[PDB]
Amino acid sequence: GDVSRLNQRNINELKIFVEKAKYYSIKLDAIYNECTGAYNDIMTYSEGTFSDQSKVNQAISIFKKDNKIVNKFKELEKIIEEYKPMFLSKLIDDFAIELDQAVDNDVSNARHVADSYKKLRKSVVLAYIESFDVISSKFVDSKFVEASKKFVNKAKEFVEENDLIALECIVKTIGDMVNDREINSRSRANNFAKKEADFLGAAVELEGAYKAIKQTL
């Protein structure tokens, strides 16, 4: 029986999300580039020797100064909040609290800032996938829903290997599908090529289901 009207409403919701979230990977890269030195310094020099306390203090400053990094995470949260309300809220608060307490010089405290940052950045990537999951799950097309669950699973496995690389690939690939650009199914990576290709395989299946919907419209 014809469910064209429902399928067009589902496509509309997906296209809105993807276009609104299209800078998600660029914005997470900007956090990565500003914080990586500081994160690595905290991990290296947090061994209780105070030998490099000044380096740890400067690394904490990168994460804390002008609330800038916290606000970058809040900007990414504002994109997903419509779709996964309170997904990131707790982890953003836990980071904010650790940053406050890091004024107390301590090796543990700084390590907790670094750990809290790493956990929150991974959750920001997962929140993109969790938002796609919720949108996909409103589709009335069973073949699209089945392909979506597989895309979500392979997306989360890719994240386990590397959060930012997975997010970059997920954002470009779903972008290509909703803008009717043929998905490239091949990884040319020297790191994570197996997991990338597995995810691209699930994306090609989803593109097939999506195109089958579009040809009924």
Numbering used by the authors: 19 to 235
Sentences from the paper on this structure:
Lyme borreliae produce other outer surface proteins, including CspZ (also known as BbCRASP-228,29). CspZ promotes bacterial dissemination to distal tissues by evading the complement system, the first-line innate immune defense in vertebrates in the blood, through binding and recruiting a host complement inhibitor, factor H (FH). Additionally, CspZ is only produced after Lyme borreliae invade vertebrate hosts and, as such, induces CspZ-specific immune responses after natural infection.
Such a distance is unfavorable for the formation of the salt bridge, suggesting the destabilization of CspZ-YA. Additionally, the three-dimensional structure of CspZ revealed a hydrophobic core between helices G, H and I where residues Y207 and Y211 are on one side, along with F176, I183 and F217 on the other side. Further, the altered conformation in CspZ-YA prevents R206 from interacting with E186, exacerbating the cavity-mediated structural instability.
